[PDB]
């Protein structure tokens, strides 16, 4: 749900969201770990649960729509700081 | 002399000084180019 | 512009203050579009002035290019009845104007003062009384190439010496210098023969009577030899007699291209129908030269590409650039691509920036005859002009191409833009003679030899002194062809070095171990530096400022002896004789 | 596998004679020729190739021809002529490969264990790295498909041996090249590169905006493997990485202080000699 | 001559301006 | 009927065909075919090059049957064109590049079938990776030692592209044959990725190389760098008023200051620039 932002989730929403309660989610998610649809850490100092990888799913039309946002959102910044690097030195490098 | 002439006069100067600047400009890379084609060609 | 006016127009005296101020606005002007504004009014106020001045008002108006206004002040000359000063508004209008404008006015002339139109733009009364000039003076030599004859063998040689005594009289009719013998004259064969007749018509140039009386033995049809080069290349100098003068001379050479031999007469055929017909957009002349063009030929490629573009000279109908360009892509000899090289550049003629589109297009590509082509045009767009615009591109791809033929048409093209000041060129070819490939070291000797040769030109001569000692041999050739075209009519007092040279192609002459290529610049300035009996000289150049362009024609044609030898025969457009001249009557 | 495959300049070049002796048709022949290569190593090579007469319709990509009878004669020659070469495989001029393009490696399958096709690019648009080469097995997917039988890429380079450095590079000549500058390439190949990344952004969207809406098959190839793409996208500015920056740059930064430390005064010399040699030659002169 | 020195020293800035980018070309030729 | 000044153009093609076969067969003379057409009667166009199985001595070489010949054409006709072989080659593996008495044997074979077959030259021994020693030639008879061979219509085949080597003038020119000069055609095809082998993708463009070795080679450099700035107090201070030719005599040996101090600071400019530099990249265009 969350585009990689600050996915380091604490226990409270797994314990929520799983309601199962707070001394089980580090064997429920150690199980995932082991089957390895995910690939994250597990901190117990804070008892937060980074999260790094997560398995490709499958998706739908308005998953393309924002996509391509992402995707022109990215691609237009790199010809445009391409050009940045052009026009500071045009007959510099022949 | 000061409204008609001095406006020349006073502008010719700077058409010098860069003509007077660039020929020292001038014959230091002419004396540089004689050095390579003396390596060229020997 | 009306405050100069004002200026000329108010306490202010005019001792020559209406004089140098055209000076001024005609050699340092930015461009066409601020010198009209300015030039056009300077002539009014010289209608206006009480005494109408005659020289300039000819000399702005072939500069501003108006075909009907030079023709309604000869009608109040009409008007005015008196030949005495209906006179120098009518030669200076000869001599420096195009043919072009010449046959665009001639309409607005027709519509004595009757014969008048006949005696200004036929030019004849200048073209017998320069034959007048010659058959009187000629001071020349037998004993020269009686000199030079000791070098029989099986060499250049024979071609070296017709190609001397027919540049040392031309146009003086005089053959007593080949007719002491027929054997050595007709020992080598195959093109020599081709130019053994074609040297003959030089000879005979400018003269309309004995060319078709003299040359009755060489009409193809009545000896039939083994030899059709000996009968085929005697239109080649019938082309060489008329130019610049167009009659039944196109007609008669038409007619027998339309039915001939192989291209052993369609060279002479056709190179002297575009000279007759040169500059004048002849569409019969364009019509056989479609078909001699796509014969798919190697040995048609001369024949066609430069006629056509002679025909087309300043013309630039884009049409007949884009089938030139269009044709030498595909086809798969060199002298098709050879001969359309020189001929796309010469289509354009003095533009300044109608041909930049094309002279990138050319450059960019990668064809390195192509490329060497685009060099000569973009020296025939900018003919004597001081733009450094065009100086930037043209040369820097004097540095950095990897062809020696683009690299010597690259430094070749200088003069040719720069001749209008001599004294630049040698401060920025110098550096240029010292350089690594003889290439460049051949074509920085040429550049000082187009430019500076009207001139005894003091630092020219002290340049060109050390590079006749270069182990390249034809480095050591465009040295004495420099040599000879910097001090023609010029005799020890302009410079010292004139008889210091006179004995060094005789030093280089007369030695058995030198080269065929080194001594081959020698022969060939012996017949440079006594030319016509030091009558004619070359001139790029009028008084007026303007410049004579079959002379440049001829002066860029003449570059190319390394690819064919008598197509820098084509030299006689660029003598011209130094010689006052009285008239009272017509006659 | 062969993951990689080493070709020598001759060819990329003997392929391009053969789409010139054709290329009188203009409009679309496909140049089809047979590959000679080094069964080496688990790396490959290839040093030689030949032609072979092929054609091929517009409509119904099944009617096409091989010679067997013309491979097996002039293959029989470079054998007689040459015993150290044996074949590897083909190759065929396409810019794109065709739907055709499978058959034809099952033909000669039988001739090579593991025969390897190479498409070559007599036009590359594309400024980048032409000639890239396949090899084919089967992936059977959990649809249900009999044989999933595509090919997979291979990467490849340019070859080089010591005869034939000699004869291209005499070649190159017709053109200017700077090999020899220092930091002049440098600067393009960052340019070189990043107009590749722009490249493969414009053809990736392309295909993502087709895929959207109105017409093309939506299927689980790509879309969620290019979803894993958009998993690694480092977060570069936050708070540990920038102690990564502020660590190791400086460090560069002083080297190139030293540098330019001692440049200046190595530039400092030839000032000094050249001012005593100046003077002193000109005040015993005068 | 005084609007002539003008004009004149103008012409000898761009015509000598035009060989100080030809030994850049030059030098930079002659490394390679 | 006359000679002029002929050209011999190339395909791309032969050269390389040319050399490889010559330097695998490199301490004999090895053999070849050369097949092309006869454009006009002023150049001359080869577009093809094979070779043929062979017999060699030290000293000698021959070739073997002549049934490869037909056969091997007859399979060249039918896939692209029916082609006209022009002439033949062979090798002088480091010599004066220079037709030999049998070569010469062979030409008076090849002259009498047809009229302007070409006798070629390779030697890939004496060429370096910079330029390529190709030679060309085609003979004369002795017949006509005295009357003139060329007409010699212009000066492209007289003073260009050299004066004749004086080991190759010592068996040859201009005695019994005349050399030729050879160009090089290219169409634009071919001439469009000739220019472009050397590159890569963007994986090269976008390396950074590894910051342990990077900053280790940079611990590298520096350290003897060091060192080359002790040895460069002592020579500059030294200065031993000696009228530097005798400087630059008692240099050759072991000497070396300001050589290597140039070339340090050039290699310590151009890794870090870049390594920076690709790596603001990375920064500035992903995410």
Same mark, same amino acid.
Do not use: Q
């Given at each position: 749900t969350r585009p990689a932002n600050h996915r380091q989730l604490t226990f409270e929403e797994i314990a929520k969201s799983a309601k199962?309660?707070?001394?089980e989610v580090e064997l429920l998610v150690m199980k995932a770990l082991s089957v390895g649809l995910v690939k994250g850490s597990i901190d117990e100092v804070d008892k937060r649960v980074h999260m790094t990888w997560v398995q490709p799913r499958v998706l739908d039309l308005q998953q393309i729509k924002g996509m391509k946002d992402r995707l022109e959102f990215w691609c237009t910044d790199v010809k445009s700081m391409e050009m940045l690097v052009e026009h500071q030195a045009h007959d510099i490098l022949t | 002399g000061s409204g008609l002439r001095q406006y020349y006069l006073s502008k010719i100067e700077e058409l010098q000084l860069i003509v007077n600047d660039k020929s020292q400009n001038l014959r230091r890379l002419q004396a540089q180019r004689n050095e390579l084609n003396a390596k060229v060609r020997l | 512009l009306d405050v100069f006016e004002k200026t000329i127009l108010e306490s202010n005296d005019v001792p020559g203050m209406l004089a140098y101020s055209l000076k001024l606005c005609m050699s340092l002007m930015q461009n066409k579009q601020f010198r009209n504004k300015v030039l056009r009014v300077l002539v009014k106020i010289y209608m206006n002035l009480e005494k109408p001045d005659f020289i300039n008002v000819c000399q702005c108006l072939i500069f501003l290019d108006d075909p009907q206004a030079v023709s309604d002040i000869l009608e109040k000359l009409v008007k005015e009845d008196? &030949? &005495?000063?209906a006179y120098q508004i009518c030669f200076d209008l000869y001599e420096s104007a195009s043919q072009q404008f010449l046959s665009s006015v001639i309409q607005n002339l027709r519509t004595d003062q009757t014969l008048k139109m006949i005696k200004i733009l036929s030019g004849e009364m200048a073209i017998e009384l320069h034959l007048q000039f010659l058959i009187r003076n000629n001071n020349t030599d037998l004993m020269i190439l009686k000199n030079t004859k000791d070098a029989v063998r099986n060499s250049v040689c024979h071609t070296a010496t017709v190609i001397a005594n027919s540049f040392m009289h031309c146009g003086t009719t005089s053959d007593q210098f080949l007719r002491d013998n027929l054997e050595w004259l007709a020992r080598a064969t195959n093109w020599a023969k081709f130019t053994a007749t074609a040297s003959l018509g030089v000879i005979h140039k400018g003269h309309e009577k004995e060319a078709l009386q003299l040359m009755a033995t060489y009409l193809p049809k009545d000896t039939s030899p083994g030899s059709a080069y000996q009968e085929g290349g005697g239109l080649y100098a019938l082309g060489l007699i008329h130019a610049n003068h167009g009659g039944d001379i196109i007609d008669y050479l038409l007619n027998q291209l339309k039915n001939a031999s192989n291209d052993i007469v369609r060279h002479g055929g056709s190179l002297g129908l575009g000279l007759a017909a040169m500059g004048t957009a002849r569409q019969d002349v364009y019509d056989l030269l479609k078909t001699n063009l796509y014969q798919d030929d190697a040995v048609t490629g001369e024949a066609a590409g430069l006629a056509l573009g002679l025909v087309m000279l300043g013309s630039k109908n884009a049409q007949a650039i884009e089938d030139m360009v269009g044709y030498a892509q595909e086809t798969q000899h060199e002298k098709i691509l050879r001969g359309l090289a020189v001929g796309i550049a010469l289509?354009?003629?003095?533009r300044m920036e109608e041909a930049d589109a094309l002279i990138e297009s050319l450059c960019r590509d990668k064809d390195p005859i192509l490329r060497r082509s685009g060099m000569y045009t973009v020296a025939m767009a900018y003919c004597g002009s001081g733009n450094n615009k065009a100086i930037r591109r043209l040369l820097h791809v004097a540095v950095s191409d990897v062809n020696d033929d683009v690299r010597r048409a690259a430094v070749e093209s200088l003069g040719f833009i720069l001749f209008r000041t001599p004294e630049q060129c040698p401060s920025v070819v110098s550096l240029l003679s010292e350089s690594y490939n003889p290439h460049v070291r051949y074509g920085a000797a040429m550049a000082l030899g187009i430019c500076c040769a009207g001139t005894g030109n003091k630092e020219a001569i002290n340049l060109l002194e050390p590079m006749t000692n270069d182990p390249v041999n034809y480095v050591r050739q465009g040295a004495l062809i420099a040599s000879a075209l910097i001090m023609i009519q010029q005799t020890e007092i302009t410079c010292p070095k004139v008889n210091q040279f006179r004995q060094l192609y005789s030093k280089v002459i007369n030695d058995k171990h030198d080269d065929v290529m080194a001594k081959f610049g020698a022969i060939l300035a012996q017949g440079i530096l006594d030319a016509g009996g030091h009558n004619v000289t070359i001139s790029l150049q009028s008084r007026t400022g303007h410049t004579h362009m079959p002379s440049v024609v001829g002066v860029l044609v003449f570059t190319q002896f390394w690819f064919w030898f008598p197509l820098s025969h084509f030299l006689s457009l660029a003598y011209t004789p130094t010689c006052v001249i009285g008239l009272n009557k017509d006659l | 596998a062969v993951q990689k495959v080493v070709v020598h300049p001759l060819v990329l070049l003997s392929v391009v004679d053969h789409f010139n002796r054709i290329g009188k048709v203009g409009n679309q022949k496909r140049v089809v020729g047979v590959l000679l290569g080094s069964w080496q190593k688990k790396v490959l090579d290839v040093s030689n190739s030949f032609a072979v007469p092929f054609d091929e319709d517009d409509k119904d990509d099944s009617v096409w021809f091989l010679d067997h009878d013309y491979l097996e004669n002039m293959y029989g020659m470079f054998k007689k002529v040459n015993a150290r070469e044996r074949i590897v495989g083909w190759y065929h001029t396409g810019p794109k490969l065709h739907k055709n393009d499978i058959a034809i490696n099952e033909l000669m399958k039988r001739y090579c264990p593991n025969s390897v096709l190479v498409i070559i690019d007599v036009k590359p648009k594309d400024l980048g790295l032409p000639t890239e080469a396949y090899i084919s097995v089967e992936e059977v997917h959990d649809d249900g498909t009999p044989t999933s039988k595509t090919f997979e890429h291979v990467t490849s380079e340019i070859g080089a041996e010591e005869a034939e450095e000699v004869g291209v590079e005499h070649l190159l000549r017709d053109i200017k090249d700077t090999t020899v500058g220092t930091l002049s390439q440098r600067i393009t190949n960052q340019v070189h590169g990043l107009k590749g990344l722009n490249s493969k952004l414009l053809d990736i969207r392309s295909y993502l905006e087709k895929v959207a809406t109105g017409k093309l098959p939506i299927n689980h190839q790509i879309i969620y493997q290019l979803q894993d793409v958009f998993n690694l996208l480092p977060d570069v500015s936050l708070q540990e990485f920038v102690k990564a920056f502020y660590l190791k740059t400086n460090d560069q930064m002083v080297v190139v202080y030293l540098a330019s430390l001692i440049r200046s005064v190595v530039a400092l010399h030839n000032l000094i000699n050249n001012k005593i040699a100046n003077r002193d030659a000109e005040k015993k002169e005068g | 001559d005084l609007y002539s020195r003008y004009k004149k020293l103008q012409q000898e800035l761009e015509f000598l301006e035009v060989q100080e980018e030809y030994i850049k070309d030059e030098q930079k030729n002659l490394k390679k | 009927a006359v000679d002029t000044a002929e050209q011999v153009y190339i395909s791309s093609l032969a050269l390389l065909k040319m050399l490889k076969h010559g330097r695998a067969g490199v301490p004999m003379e090895v053999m070849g075919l050369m097949l092309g057409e006869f454009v006009d009667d002023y150049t001359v166009r080869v577009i093809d090059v094979f070779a043929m199985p062979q017999s060699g001595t030290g000293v000698s070489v021959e070739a073997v049957d002549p049934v490869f010949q037909a056969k091997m054409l007859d399979m060249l006709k039918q896939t692209g064109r029916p082609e006209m072989v022009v002439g033949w080659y062979h090798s002088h593996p480091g010599f004066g590049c220079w037709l030999s008495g049998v070569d010469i044997n062979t030409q008076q074979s090849f002259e009498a079938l047809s009229e302007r077959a070409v006798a070629v030259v390779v030697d890939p021994i004496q060429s370096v990776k910079g330029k390529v020693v190709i030679d060309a030639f085609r003979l004369i008879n002795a017949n006509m030692m005295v009357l003139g061979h060329e007409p010699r219509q212009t000066t492209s085949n007289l003073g260009h592209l050299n004066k004749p080597s004086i080991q190759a003038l010592i068996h040859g020119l201009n005695r019994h044959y005349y050399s030729i000069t050879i160009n090089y055609r290219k169409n634009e095809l071919e001439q469009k990725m000739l220019l472009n082998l050397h590159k890569k993708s963007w994986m090269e463009g976008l390396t950074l190389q590894d910051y342990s070795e990077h900053c280790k080679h940079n611990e590298s450099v520096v350290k003897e760098m060091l060192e080359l700035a002790k040895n460069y107090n002592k020579a500059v201070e030294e +200065?031993?008023?000696?009228?530097? +030719?005798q400087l630059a005599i008692k240099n050759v040996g072991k000497q070396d200051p300001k050589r290597h101090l140039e070339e340090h600071v050039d290699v310590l400019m151009t890794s870090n620039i870049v390594q920076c530099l690709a790596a603001m990249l990375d920064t500035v265009v992903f995410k």
């Open positions: 199962i309660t707070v001394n | - | 008196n &030949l &005495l000063m289509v354009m003629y003095g | - | - | +200065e031993d008023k000696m009228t530097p +030719e």
